[PDB]
Amino acid sequence: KVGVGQAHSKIILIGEHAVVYGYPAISLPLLEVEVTCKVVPAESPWRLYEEDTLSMAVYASLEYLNITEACIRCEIDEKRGMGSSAAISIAAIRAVFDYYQADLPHDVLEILVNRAEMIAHMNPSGLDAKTCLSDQPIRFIKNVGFTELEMDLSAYLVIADTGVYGHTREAIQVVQNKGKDALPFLHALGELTQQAEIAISQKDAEGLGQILSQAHLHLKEIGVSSLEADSLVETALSHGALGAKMSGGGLGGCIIALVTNLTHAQELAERLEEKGAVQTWIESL
Amino acid sequence: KVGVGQAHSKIILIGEHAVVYGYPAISLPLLEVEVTCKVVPAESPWRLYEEDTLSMAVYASLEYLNITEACIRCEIDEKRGMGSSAAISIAAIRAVFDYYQADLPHDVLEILVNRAEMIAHMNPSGLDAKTCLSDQPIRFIKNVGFTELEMDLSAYLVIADTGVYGHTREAIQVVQNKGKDALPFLHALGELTQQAEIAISQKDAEGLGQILSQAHLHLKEIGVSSLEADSLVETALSHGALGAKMSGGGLGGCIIALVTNLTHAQELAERLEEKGAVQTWIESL
Numbered sequence: 001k002v003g004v005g006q007a008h009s010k011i012i013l014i015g016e017h018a019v020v021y022g023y024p025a026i027s028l029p030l031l032e033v034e035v036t037c038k039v040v041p042a043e044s045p046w047r048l049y050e051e052d053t054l055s056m057a058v059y060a061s062l063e064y065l066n067i068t069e070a071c072i073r074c075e076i077d078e079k080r081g082m083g084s085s086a087a088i089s090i091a092a093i094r095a096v097f098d099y100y101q102a103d104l105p106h107d108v109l110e111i112l113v114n115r116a117e118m119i120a121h122m123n124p125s126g127l128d129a130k131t132c133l134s135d136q137p138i139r140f141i142k143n144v145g146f147t148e149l150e151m152d153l154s155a156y157l158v159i160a161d162t163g164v165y166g167h168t169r170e171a172i173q174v175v176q177n178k179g180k181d182a183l184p185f186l187h188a189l190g191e192l193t194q195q196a197e198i199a200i201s202q203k204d205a206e207g208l209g210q211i212l213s214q215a216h217l218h219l220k221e222i223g224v225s226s227l228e229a230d231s232l233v234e235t236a237l238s239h240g241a242l243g244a245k246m247s248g249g250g251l252g253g254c255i256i257a258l259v260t261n262l263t264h265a266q267e268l269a270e271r272l273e274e275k276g277a278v279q280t281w282i283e284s285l
Numbered sequence: 286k287v288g289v290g291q292a293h294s295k296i297i298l299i300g301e302h303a304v305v306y307g308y309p310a311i312s313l314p315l316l317e318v319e320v321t322c323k324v325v326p327a328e329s330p331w332r333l334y335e336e337d338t339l340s341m342a343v344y345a346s347l348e349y350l351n352i353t354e355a356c357i358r359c360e361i362d363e364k365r366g367m368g369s370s371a372a373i374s375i376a377a378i379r380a381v382f383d384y385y386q387a388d389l390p391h392d393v394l395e396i397l398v399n400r401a402e403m404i405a406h407m408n409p410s411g412l413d414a415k416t417c418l419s420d421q422p423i424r425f426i427k428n429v430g431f432t433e434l435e436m437d438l439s440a441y442l443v444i445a446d447t448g449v450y451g452h453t454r455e456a457i458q459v460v461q462n463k464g465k466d467a468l469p470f471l472h473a474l475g476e477l478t479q480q481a482e483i484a485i486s487q488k489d490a491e492g493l494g495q496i497l498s499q500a501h502l503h504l505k506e507i508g509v510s511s512l513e514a515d516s517l518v519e520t521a522l523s524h525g526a527l528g529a530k531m532s533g534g535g536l537g538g539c540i541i542a543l544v545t546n547l548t549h550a551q552e553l554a555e556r557l558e559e560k561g562a563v564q565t566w567i568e569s570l
């Protein structure tokens with residue numbers, strides 16, 4: 001007997017970092033980008049060596065089940081770097097309960113994914129987890145709620161993994177340390193997110209693309225982008241992408257690019273891997 | 286013309302600090318404990334000198350309304366120290382919109398109170414604001430949600446203000462810096478909150494009181510209580526309180542004590558002010 005669990009991932013269109021301060025964020029489920037965790041028997045009991053979201057999901061699950069001596073090991077595993085912190089949490093929790101064949105209502109799961117994220121010190125706005133449990137793009141505000149969005153632009157979004165494992169915590173630190181000097185950054189993002197909705201409302205991928213490139217500049221100035229991400233966006237843009245920006249926690253992670261044609265989309269991903277992206281993925285919009 | 290806004294407050298029964306890591310928290314509306322803010326005309330435009338939740342509520346309101354030159358001043362004002370960070374935010378926002386006679390749906394308000402709290406760097410779990418907008422006690426978990434609780438113990442809760450202005454941010458820092466050593470603290474609180482629900486379910490004020498005293502010890506050990514708070518609880522207990530603990534952000538703030546008789550309640554508050562509490566208040570349960 002082996003326990004297995006699997007979660008889908010997501011990608012942030014816009015609102016990264018700003019969501020942390022109560023500003024809206026729009027994100028898209030990545031239903032075909034999944035993560036899997038297996039749980040197996042072990043000689044010695046399971047221990048806690050780190051504050052990473054996986055170990056933390058195990059712990060939070062064990063605490064719940066009330067098991068201190070869990071003689072088990074929980075490894076991971078696709079599309080590697082495209083699985084988020086929450087995605088990993090969800091998968092583990094499921095794998096753990098499944099191993100123990102424990103009952104798991106959706107409320108509980110959601111409660112435990114967010115708790116693991118929190119004790120992993122990821123400082124969740126609640127957006128990652130939320131989107132990984134949704135099957136529709138959503139509009140989100142921390143500590144308040146979300147609404148599902150209609151998303152039909154007949155466009156494609158190309159996702160590229162920078163290869164650099166995102167230092168999300170450090171990124172939140174940067175924006176946090178800026179204090180009041182982040183307000184203009186936050187403000188600018190708040191606006192861009194508003195227009196982003198309009199554009200989406202009007203099914204104007206071009207308008208949208210523009211807004212995204214902008215979002216990237218502000219994310220870059222505030223200091224949470226990366227050279228890998230920046231050069232990938234540049235490549236994106238220098239190949240006719242309606243727009244491009246980094247998505248997620250920053251300081252590593254992924255890039256997203258907007259396009260309205262399939263030939264173009266496949267071309268862009270190729271071009272990107274060619275430039276050094278470890279993986280790519282094309283999502284319909 | 287003068288703008289005015291008014292919010293009610295709340296008190297945390299249990300889950301302080303632990304709620305920050307995704308653990309449940311139970312809190313009670315304080316409908317008769319209100320805060321008021323007035324907004325008036327001014328010579329020079331309004332500026333931002335600090336990251337305190339009031340100024341932050343003004344800013345977030347102005348940003349929303351899209352007013353940069355707000356030639357206005359927004360002062361505060363009762364039951365002083367019993368008004369929370371969110372309570373102050375709510376009152377200001379209302380006073381500001383009211384001054385401008387701007388439309389304000391409840392969604393917007395709630396969105397702006399939480400945003401102000403966030404830019405004021407208060408690190409809201411969402412509980413303060415939530416309870417200040419509720420008229421029923423609630424069970425709460427960060428980034429997930431809340432449920433209203435039935436609360437009928439025919440008991441009284443005595444609230445005492447330590448006088449020391451709570452250093453809530455610093456307190457969150459302490460628990461944050463403990464890292465993994467806070468897990469046992471969090472765990473213990475998670476449990477206590479569970480029993481707290483049971484007791485409430487069974488209308489067992491004694492059982493409940495016990496749990497509260499315990500909650501105070503763990504809050505004290507982890508290092509977020511205060512001498513003023515501790516000595517007040519001690520006085521509470523040394524006078525037959527079913528239980529007592531600090532409530533709120535810690536490092537200052539208030540104490541709550543449980544009792545089931547009115548004579549006892551009034552007696553306790555007196556005794557407490559006598560010991561140095563700046564204000565007291567008795568809420569029905």
Ligand SMILES: C[C@@](O)(CCOP(=O)(O)OP(=O)(O)O)CC(=O)O
Pocket residue numbers: 012015016017018019020083084085086123124125126127128166168171172247248249253
């Ligand atoms: C900074 C944030 O606003 C965005 C984080 O984006 P992701 O959750 O996609 O990042 P990782 O899971 O670390 O790869 C934090 C937050 O809102 O949770």
Ligand SMILES: C[C@@](O)(CCOP(=O)(O)OP(=O)(O)O)CC(=O)O
Pocket residue numbers: 297300301302303304305368369370371408409410411412413451453456457532533534538
């Ligand atoms: C530490 C916390 O869990 C409890 C804060 O309690 P209050 O919001 O009542 O404190 P103040 O408004 O500063 O007086 C933080 C949180 O959950 O928001």
Ligand SMILES: [Mg+2]
Pocket residue numbers: 084085086122128
């Ligand atoms: Mg994340």
Ligand SMILES: [Mg+2]
Pocket residue numbers: 369370371407413
């Ligand atoms: Mg507060």
